[PDB]
């Protein structure tokens, strides 16, 4: 849950090619003496320096859960009509289980 | 790890966590009103001195009031061990009057009884530190004591008295200062030459409310559920070395009583609720040739050694019928407070609660004596046959006996704390019931 | 244990007097589980 | 004055007083039902005396029951310093049966362990006053001792048992009295000639309900969330003086558990959770020529001196997997109760909570052992290398060692406190899980 | 010294842990170093004065994937069959010189287990799984008077 | 790092997948040959993943 | 020895610090150890020869929430009303005879 | 890591391959695609008699 | 190192070479004051 999407390696924009890359540029471009091309056309040379990415998805929905804020945790004297919160000490699970076990 | 426990979920966990209602890990505090608390000195009318009466009008320096502390400056008239809660003793009594009418009243002995039953642990020690000399201070030592009051509004903000709703009624405290204070201006019956008179100051903590809150207090009627103390002094039937004296005391009480409390004492010595004896903390000089069982070690006046208490057993009777079966004095001294308070009560002080939680504000069962034609407290005393000057006899004795010096405990104090309603409206107030 | 004749010439069911010092027992079990990785997070399919 | 605090209010106070919800100066107390409390004596079946098993059926005097106090009369078979909580030692155990079903059971050692962890301050002292002689009483002294029970309904009115709703089922308490009580009828292994047999009485505090509340209880179903104690006694991997013992104790526990508690002890000396030593209070005669480290100073059996305790470290595994980091014995003795209870725990007594607030009644996190097929407590003990008769060795030693006399602590008591539901309907009742 | 680890992913590329598909989870190694090491800072129970503290370094061998393989890992769920070690320590029923001690040890284990393994040892001496004796390789000074 | 001490390390995301892990230690003999037994193994008391 | 901390989240479950919702931010504690401790490595101003250095450890109690509560904490913004300690040192006016 | 045998002192190996002892060409390094391929060695001092 | 990649590296000798070439006058002197003892300090002297 660290929230670190980083690769953590020199692969984002390092451009780990050899010196042969300068010759590959002459393959991407069309030349024989490139000492005059970047002094004039710098936009195309900036276009030949761009990375290709791939995005990633994930989704989990939402947890709509109310009933929070439990500050006073000592006890709570029940209201006059206690048989509205009294039949909650044991839910319908341990109430239906004892009836199904009768067979 | 923690996950191995969470995963372990069964049918029997349903009633603990299924259909949850709260979470413990995220709290939302309540938003509250805007207010402030200030300590303001009140003037003292009358004349401060031993045996004198003084009074103060609680000046309307805020909207509501709560805590009240009486300050005293005393000088020791003797060495360490000669005083016992002298500031508590000095404030002989305090009477609370609203609109010219008595609402309540406390007595020095009540403060001692109250403390004995309801304060505890370091609260009790800190209290003692504010009323006595507890660091072996010597003669001439001067100290500023603080005696808090325990009227209903002096214990909780919930009952803060709305001075703001009492425009035509003044709230006054009348005080009586003791004629003598042990180890300060007198030593037993002897006066202490050169003893200084006390310096006194009364402090009241005022609550300032903001505009909306104070307006509501001023305009709306109020019904405050409050406490009152009923009290009478009685003669204790005197036990002896040949007999167990018994006594039936008709209780001239009224109102829904939270609890009764009582003690037996030697009126000579403030706070003496037990017999004196030649055992290390039970008398002046205990343990040596100079030991006497006519004078207490005042600094050690109290004790938890019931052997020195006078009461054997007791019951409360209502309209000719036993309220409960007769129980031993130790029930009322140890069990009652175990179950109902949670502190430790010193020997000679007894409690009987009608309430589930008598130490709190919320009523939890009361005995309404206004509907009881004949309430009576029935007391049986121990046989006073033990030679108080002989540790073997003092410490090796039986359940039904006490010290021969227990016959000096001729005073009986019976208290009842009850609930009434303080009705305040249209600038004036008083009680719902007489 | 201090006498080779006894140490080396003994029977199948006996050992050195010094074997009583081997008071610790370590028991291991090597098992399988499944380490799941999804949506950037790891976890174990089998809790117990 | 204080009005200047009130007035100097701003944006940072919005989370405290903006759109206020509550005040503190006006308390509305809840109106409650009409009831009364009475302490009524039960009749005990069987003969009370040392080593006897007796029981009582609770009479239908009131409608609900809460507090129960067992009274005893014991005498001193020797002088001060010879007994230790003898009334607690005497009540060897108590079993609660409802409808013929076992609901719960407490043991004398549990009362001691419980006290060590959950009572505190003057509650603890007062409790001691109700079970022992604490004012240096001498041989022949007689005293009325009270032992409040610690079953779920004995702690709060909240769990009052509705005997009224149990019209067809009886409620019984079975009490086992110890064959011997130290300093009362036996001094170590030696019988005390002339020792008295104890007297005994069981008192039940009943709640009397008025008409409407009483009718509802008699007729309607009730479900109480209650606590139960699980307990097993077992042998200790008693540490050697030469090395560190260890032990894997499978835990035969079930149900949602709030906490585990345990101690190491010497069964021949009640309450002895630590080793004996020639340091003040740690043994009979400690500090002098007569000191012996085989016999405790009984009156000072309990201690906070961890050097005499035997646990080096421990962990709990669930289904063979580590629950938490292995922790030192002093963690379980001092920090756990700091974190979860707020009192002070005596040396030799350990606690591990799964709950945020184990001392309360409200569930606050549990470990359901019914889902943990192989829960195990894993212990590591200290080396018993220290010569107990020499303070230089006893008091100047390292974290991982203890007294040579720590090998007397051969028994281990492991407790677990859990939840269950006591269901009452149509005049009958019992547990949801059993 | 170089101590290789023996966790499931330390044995084969087949189980290389997909850090690439763990964008939200860190992977950590927690270590405890021994209080004593025989022949380095302690000779039996005797501390060695002047012994040096160790120098430590942890090395991890990383795999760099090409674009397509890297991307697939980053965008996919994975399920790696792994091994885990379960372990508990117990006391050996103390062997006796007078009889044959015996013991029943409840095995608080779980999951599909490939195998069990165990040893008995003298916890004082790391790696001692056997008794000591005066035979040439079985004890200090074996074969002589000392 | 030291005898009896605890240390930890986070494996940084310095690549896409990981396999081998080697813990290096430098130790110095406190006695002569015959006094040690796999001391770097002994030193690595434990490791948690 | 065990020294409990007294930061706002160390006093009540109600203020438990939501590491779960602090995914991008680390939570750190910086501890300053005294140069001298009375009766441990110094006696008044005098160093105690041979005194040992402390061994230190920090333990944290972590709450594991089940899925629905855990998810809710992670997805929601939160506000916790907490306390902070303000502190400055001053020279005491020298009191005099 | 890569072979499983024991190499004598003075002989050093650096593999690119996952299994250099095998025939399946896994994990190789193409040196003709790398302009500057340099092995940088540091020697111990020769001080021991 | 940023993001796991080496950006750069210095050596004590580089700092010395760099200084020898690029710092000067009182910058160089002040630098020396921050890395050495230039006021005839004696054995045992402690400086940050």
PDB file of C-alpha atoms in Angstrom, chain G:
ATOM      1  CA  UNK G   1      12.200  -0.494  30.279  1.00  0.00           C
ATOM      2  CA  UNK G   2       9.156   0.379  28.282  1.00  0.00           C
ATOM      3  CA  UNK G   3       8.429   3.981  27.486  1.00  0.00           C
ATOM      4  CA  UNK G   4       4.931   4.391  26.024  1.00  0.00           C
ATOM      5  CA  UNK G   5       4.545   7.302  23.714  1.00  0.00           C
ATOM      6  CA  UNK G   6       2.029  10.035  24.331  1.00  0.00           C
ATOM      7  CA  UNK G   7       1.192  11.315  20.839  1.00  0.00           C
ATOM      8  CA  UNK G   8      -2.481  11.767  20.096  1.00  0.00           C
ATOM      9  CA  UNK G   9      -2.826   8.376  18.369  1.00  0.00           C
ATOM     10  CA  UNK G  10      -1.172   6.593  21.254  1.00  0.00           C
ATOM     11  CA  UNK G  11      -3.963   7.585  23.627  1.00  0.00           C
ATOM     12  CA  UNK G  12      -7.173   6.272  22.102  1.00  0.00           C
ATOM     13  CA  UNK G  13      -8.339   3.818  19.399  1.00  0.00           C
ATOM     14  CA  UNK G  14     -10.587   6.689  18.272  1.00  0.00           C
ATOM     15  CA  UNK G  15      -7.584   8.509  16.856  1.00  0.00           C
ATOM     16  CA  UNK G  16      -5.807   5.512  15.411  1.00  0.00           C
ATOM     17  CA  UNK G  17      -3.601   6.859  12.706  1.00  0.00           C
ATOM     18  CA  UNK G  18      -4.890   5.553   9.342  1.00  0.00           C
ATOM     19  CA  UNK G  19      -1.715   4.290   7.731  1.00  0.00           C
ATOM     20  CA  UNK G  20      -4.132   2.720   5.243  1.00  0.00           C
ATOM     21  CA  UNK G  21      -5.250   6.160   4.061  1.00  0.00           C
ATOM     22  CA  UNK G  22      -1.698   7.574   4.216  1.00  0.00           C
ATOM     23  CA  UNK G  23      -0.641   5.452   1.298  1.00  0.00           C
ATOM     24  CA  UNK G  24       1.692   8.120  -0.151  1.00  0.00           C
ATOM     25  CA  UNK G  25       3.129   9.414   3.122  1.00  0.00           C
ATOM     26  CA  UNK G  26       5.406   7.673   5.461  1.00  0.00           C
ATOM     27  CA  UNK G  27       5.062   8.007   9.170  1.00  0.00           C
ATOM     28  CA  UNK G  28       8.295   8.423  11.020  1.00  0.00           C
ATOM     29  CA  UNK G  29       9.513   8.849  14.515  1.00  0.00           C
ATOM     30  CA  UNK G  30      12.774  10.554  15.285  1.00  0.00           C
ATOM     31  CA  UNK G  31      14.191   9.795  18.733  1.00  0.00           C
ATOM     32  CA  UNK G  32      16.894  11.756  20.551  1.00  0.00           C
ATOM     33  CA  UNK G  33      18.713   9.865  23.180  1.00  0.00           C
ATOM     34  CA  UNK G  34      20.186  11.754  26.102  1.00  0.00           C
ATOM     35  CA  UNK G  35      23.964  12.130  26.293  1.00  0.00           C
ATOM     36  CA  UNK G  36      23.725  11.170  29.887  1.00  0.00           C
ATOM     37  CA  UNK G  37      21.331   9.340  32.083  1.00  0.00           C
ATOM     38  CA  UNK G  38      21.513   9.558  35.824  1.00  0.00           C
ATOM     39  CA  UNK G  39      22.517   6.390  37.574  1.00  0.00           C
ATOM     40  CA  UNK G  40      23.021   4.617  34.274  1.00  0.00           C
ATOM     41  CA  UNK G  41      26.059   6.209  32.644  1.00  0.00           C
ATOM     42  CA  UNK G  42      26.644   9.315  34.825  1.00  0.00           C
ATOM     43  CA  UNK G  43      26.374  10.216  38.523  1.00  0.00           C
ATOM     44  CA  UNK G  44      25.668  13.894  38.693  1.00  0.00           C
ATOM     45  CA  UNK G  45      28.421  15.286  36.463  1.00  0.00           C
ATOM     46  CA  UNK G  46      30.737  12.266  36.785  1.00  0.00           C
ATOM     47  CA  UNK G  47      30.895   9.648  34.070  1.00  0.00           C
ATOM     48  CA  UNK G  48      30.473   6.067  35.205  1.00  0.00           C
ATOM     49  CA  UNK G  49      33.319   4.017  33.912  1.00  0.00           C
ATOM     50  CA  UNK G  50      32.252   0.814  32.226  1.00  0.00           C
ATOM     51  CA  UNK G  51      28.648   1.901  31.727  1.00  0.00           C
ATOM     52  CA  UNK G  52      26.868   0.012  28.953  1.00  0.00           C
ATOM     53  CA  UNK G  53      25.246   1.628  25.932  1.00  0.00           C
ATOM     54  CA  UNK G  54      21.448   1.157  25.738  1.00  0.00           C
ATOM     55  CA  UNK G  55      19.794  -1.448  23.600  1.00  0.00           C
ATOM     56  CA  UNK G  56      16.815   0.123  21.875  1.00  0.00           C
ATOM     57  CA  UNK G  57      13.661  -1.216  20.272  1.00  0.00           C
ATOM     58  CA  UNK G  58      10.439   0.334  18.996  1.00  0.00           C
ATOM     59  CA  UNK G  59       7.174  -1.557  19.062  1.00  0.00           C
ATOM     60  CA  UNK G  60       4.009  -0.496  17.261  1.00  0.00           C
ATOM     61  CA  UNK G  61       0.506  -1.863  17.698  1.00  0.00           C
ATOM     62  CA  UNK G  62      -1.119  -2.290  14.289  1.00  0.00           C
ATOM     63  CA  UNK G  63      -4.850  -2.775  13.847  1.00  0.00           C
ATOM     64  CA  UNK G  64      -6.019  -5.033  11.150  1.00  0.00           C
ATOM     65  CA  UNK G  65      -9.461  -4.158   9.937  1.00  0.00           C
ATOM     66  CA  UNK G  66     -11.678  -6.532   8.080  1.00  0.00           C
ATOM     67  CA  UNK G  67     -12.553  -5.881   4.430  1.00  0.00           C
ATOM     68  CA  UNK G  68     -15.511  -3.553   4.612  1.00  0.00           C
ATOM     69  CA  UNK G  69     -14.027  -1.196   7.252  1.00  0.00           C
ATOM     70  CA  UNK G  70     -10.588  -1.413   5.573  1.00  0.00           C
ATOM     71  CA  UNK G  71     -12.049  -0.524   2.185  1.00  0.00           C
ATOM     72  CA  UNK G  72     -14.060   2.355   3.637  1.00  0.00           C
ATOM     73  CA  UNK G  73     -10.968   3.827   5.266  1.00  0.00           C
ATOM     74  CA  UNK G  74      -8.937   3.536   2.129  1.00  0.00           C
ATOM     75  CA  UNK G  75     -11.568   5.156  -0.120  1.00  0.00           C
ATOM     76  CA  UNK G  76     -12.660   8.070   2.094  1.00  0.00           C
ATOM     77  CA  UNK G  77     -10.951  11.354   3.087  1.00  0.00           C
ATOM     78  CA  UNK G  78     -10.652  11.680   6.842  1.00  0.00           C
ATOM     79  CA  UNK G  79     -10.359  14.343   9.469  1.00  0.00           C
ATOM     80  CA  UNK G  80      -9.137  13.581  13.005  1.00  0.00           C
ATOM     81  CA  UNK G  81      -9.327  16.171  15.793  1.00  0.00           C
ATOM     82  CA  UNK G  82      -6.058  15.687  17.585  1.00  0.00           C
ATOM     83  CA  UNK G  83      -3.926  17.246  20.206  1.00  0.00           C
ATOM     84  CA  UNK G  84      -0.381  18.649  19.744  1.00  0.00           C
ATOM     85  CA  UNK G  85       2.241  19.732  22.259  1.00  0.00           C
ATOM     86  CA  UNK G  86       3.706  23.204  22.051  1.00  0.00           C
ATOM     87  CA  UNK G  87       6.876  23.846  23.992  1.00  0.00           C
ATOM     88  CA  UNK G  88       9.531  26.426  24.555  1.00  0.00           C
ATOM     89  CA  UNK G  89      12.292  26.732  27.153  1.00  0.00           C
ATOM     90  CA  UNK G  90      12.807  29.894  29.219  1.00  0.00           C
ATOM     91  CA  UNK G  91      15.325  31.122  31.763  1.00  0.00           C
ATOM     92  CA  UNK G  92      13.818  31.234  35.253  1.00  0.00           C
ATOM     93  CA  UNK G  93      14.233  34.638  36.810  1.00  0.00           C
ATOM     94  CA  UNK G  94      16.742  33.847  39.442  1.00  0.00           C
ATOM     95  CA  UNK G  95      14.822  33.750  42.771  1.00  0.00           C
ATOM     96  CA  UNK G  96      16.724  35.309  45.642  1.00  0.00           C
ATOM     97  CA  UNK G  97      17.172  35.298  49.362  1.00  0.00           C
TER      98      UNK G  97
END
